Design a protein around this ligand. Structure first.
Ligand code: NI
Length: 341
């Protein structure tokens, strides 16, 4: 059965609620982004209207084979009417195609559902600036002050400088980047750009990337692995055994691997600056864990909420334990006392 925090009161609507079968009273299913915890349940046999971004809809049609007649793509930053209710989709600063959804209820209540997001001060100048929000359904993934990490720009600067140094020292080194889901594409695209290379990958990953409306993509990616010195591999193969095995396959073209694992936060963030990060090494293989996050840090989250001043907050992440829920409620009250709403 569908949990309450996936239902939008006063509507026929649900958000990211595809794994509960037919939800009683739901006339339109919204999907904020193409990540498996959120699309779980959708398949080619789904027969209700799905509302989403253009990019999400490309992935639903091409990767999940959802039939086209049930896919309803909406433009961003544009007032739209769905089953008689005004909605707006806003960029969530998450992965490609990810949105936040503003719902303007018939009774005058305004609800923001963030989906998954990385809060940014640029959101303070979207269509959110213009009106009051009564209820916020919030991505609370990193809702605790221990969760600190650098800007995406500092992390990319580290990666580009690390890769350019290694390959200039050793023209026979290969760079490998781990991937499992969409998101974080800037990691491998920025490295390939500094190296003057396309990025090489499997046909299935090329197919996924071709759904994302990235400008000039045909100039940046390829399935011809032999022509490329940046390769993408499944995240599970980013270890010494899997990388050794990959280097065999390259037919003596390369004699060294430098590999990157974009993670979320890890506890090494509570001790080390990005500048100071070092790899795990075995022989001619080195592996860097880099903290490239597509979710808000604690401080980013706090700033957004203190600016928006919602009347009520409903967390959508970390809701399964009483300890997590009590922790998050305590921070919500502090933020409200400190800012005065
Ligand atoms: Ni996500």
């Amino acid at each position: 059965t569908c949990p309450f925090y996936k239902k939008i009161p006063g509507t026929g609507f649900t958000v990211d609620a595809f794994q509960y079968g037919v939800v009683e009273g739901c006339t339109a299913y919204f999907l904020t982004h193409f990540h498996s915890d959120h699309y779980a349940g959708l398949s080619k046999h789904f027969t209700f209207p799905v509302y989403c971004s253009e990019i999400t809809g490309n992935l639903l049609k091409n990767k999940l084979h959802v039939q086209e007649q049930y896919i309803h793509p909406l433009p961003l930053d544009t007032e739209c009417i769905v089953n008689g209710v005004k909605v707006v989709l806003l960029d969530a600063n998450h992965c490609p195609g990810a949105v936040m959804i503003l719902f303007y209820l018939p009774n005058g209540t305004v609800i923001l559902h963030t989906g998954d997001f990385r809060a940014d001060p640029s959101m303070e100048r979207s269509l959110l600036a213009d009106q009051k929000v009564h209820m916020l359904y919030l991505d609370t993934t990193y809702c605790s002050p221990e969760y600190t990490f650098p800007s995406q720009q500092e992390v990319i600067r580290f990666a580009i400088n690390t890769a350019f140094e290694a390959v200039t020292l050793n023209p026979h080194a290969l760079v490998v980047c781990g991937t499992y889901s969409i998101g974080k594409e800037k990691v491998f695209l920025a490295i390939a750009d500094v190296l003057g290379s396309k990025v090489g990958m499997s046909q299935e990953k090329y197919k996924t990337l071709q759904c994302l409306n990235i400008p000039e993509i045909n100039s940046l990616i390829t399935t011809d692995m032999c022509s490329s010195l940046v390769h993408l591999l499944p995240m599970m193969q980013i270890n010494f055994k899997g990388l050794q095995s990959h280097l065999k396959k390259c037919g003596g073209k390369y004699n060294q691997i430098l590999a990157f694992r974009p993670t979320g936060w890890t506890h090494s963030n509570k001790f080390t600056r990005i500048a100071d990060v070092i790899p795990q090494t075995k022989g001619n293989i080195s592996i860097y864990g880099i903290p490239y996050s597509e979710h808000s840090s604690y401080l980013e989250m706090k700033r957004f909420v203190q600016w928006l001043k919602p009347q009520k907050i409903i967390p959508t992440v970390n809701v399964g334990t009483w300890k997590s829920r009590s922790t998050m409620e305590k921070y919500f009250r502090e933020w409200k006392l400190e800012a005065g709403y």
